[PDB]
Structure 1
């Protein structure tokens, strides 16, 4: 139930090797690993969950109890003397992983947003397929000339198009800080009960005129395997929030991110063909983080 090959096909981009930096690929791949651990937790939780109680002293002891009130009594203890994290963990982990991955990529599939992003990937794909560009770079037929002239006109049309206080930068910032808030949320919660999980549980329900034996104890069956799987989950989310906060705070703080003007200006300064060298609220240094060549050409 709810496997990785359908949780992935819930949410995936079509073909874009570009517009994924290395940290985004580690976020995607590590989120797939964390979903794998959560689904393994779900399978193991559905497999062998059962608890077992028995009563106190008031050879062997008989106590004259039939089997059926034993399964009633550990049913009743299973919904009273268990912590909420002892049996609601993997399902909440599934919910949080779904929210994490779709908060990773709903920046990308927003309808006001996806238009100009799709159009920009189309622009760069058509811009890479003109051999006049590598001919002029070999310096410093008869079809790509007028093709590149029409593509020039597409380029300075597109240049005049995407000039606002854009939703790309603002959307990506609020997207990153909300998934960082989700990171802070679950790692603030889960420390409290990775601190304290238990194997044996005394219980005193109100079922005294049903069996007797007011005080009796169960053992739970998850404690060792769920505790070890919990600490592996904590390690995975620790590495995730490490990479996220580290690279995303430094990418927010170190540039101005509207300095794509400045980077195309430097490109024009050493390019020997001085380009327009100025551009605002622009996307291209993400592609530079992917590859410098698709920015140069």
Structure 2
């Protein structure tokens, strides 16, 4: 049993990585649902209101749905759980890297530094690209030849859920990086 040589930071990171995998599985299940985006045209042809007749079939609506999923929605907004799953696989692979490997000190600080830089890169990229998960999307695909409308407004059904999942994911990686930075401080504070 290596639990004696497993301090609190390693066990905390293990449980956090399990949480990462659970979050990624939940996000993949969210992406499993067929109904992803819902698109309606713009400028479509007490006061009584009347519904606007878009003059569109079901399959035309589905076509605009997938087209605006293609060319208007952000790639991170479409594969955020995908990146989450890949990156937690990387986390559990390189979390036991020192265990699965002055050479002892060397590979231990190598593991800590690799974990720290992965954490920092994840923080930078997530903080940069998290704002792109929006509900109201403006889509300007050129399918006027088939539908008749050149501009569309769409809604991403689970965009709020992806933003909340990204907030929880960022909190988890934040605790991860705080405990790993404490590990690095303890390692490099003394010889």
What TM-score does the superposition give when structure 1 sets the normalisation length? 0.59
Aligned position for 1:225: 161
Q: Is residue 209 of structure 1 aligned with residue 163 of structure 2?
A: no
Return the offset for 1:61. Answer: 2.2
Aligned position for 1:41: 27
Q: Is residue 236 of structure 1 aligned with residue 172 of structure 2?
A: yes
Return the offset for 1:22. Answer: 1.6
Q: Is residue 70 of structure 1 aligned with residue 56 of structure 2?
A: no
Equivalence map 1:101-250=2 (5 Å)? 101-110=92-101, 165=102, 167-250=103-186
Q: Is residue 98 of structure 1 aligned with residue 89 of structure 2?
A: yes
Equivalence map 1:280-295=2 (5 Å)? none
Distance 2:110 2:162 in 1: 34
Structure 1 pair 196/77, CA: closer, same or farther in 2 (3 Å)? Answer: closer
Asked if structure 2 preserves the Cα contact closer than 8 Å seen for 1:39 and 1:94, the reply is yes
Structure 1 pair 36/105, CA: closer, same or farther in 2 (3 Å)? Answer: same
What secondary structure, in the 3-state scheme, does the structure 2 residue paired with 1:79 have? helix
- CA RMSD in angstroms comes to 1.6
Asked if structure 2 preserves the Cα contact closer than 8 Å seen for 1:51 and 1:74, the reply is yes
Distance 1:38 1:77 in 2: 24
Consecutive unaligned residues of structure 2, counting only runs of 5 or more, are none
Return the offset for 1:243. Answer: 1.0
Distance 1:108 1:185 in 2: 23
Larger Rg: 1
Return the offset for 1:49. Answer: 4.8
What TM-score does the superposition give when structure 2 sets the normalisation length? 0.90
Distance 2:10 2:55 in 1: 63
Equivalence map 1:74-85=2 (5 Å)? 74-85=65-76
- Show CA shifts across 1:160-186 (max 9, x none): xxxxx3x31111111110111100001
4+ residue segments displaced more than 6 Å: none
Structure 1 pair 206/196, CA: closer, same or farther in 2 (3 Å)? Answer: closer
Q: Which has the higher contact order (CA 8 A, sep 6+)?
A: 2
Return the offset for 1:196. Answer: 4.5
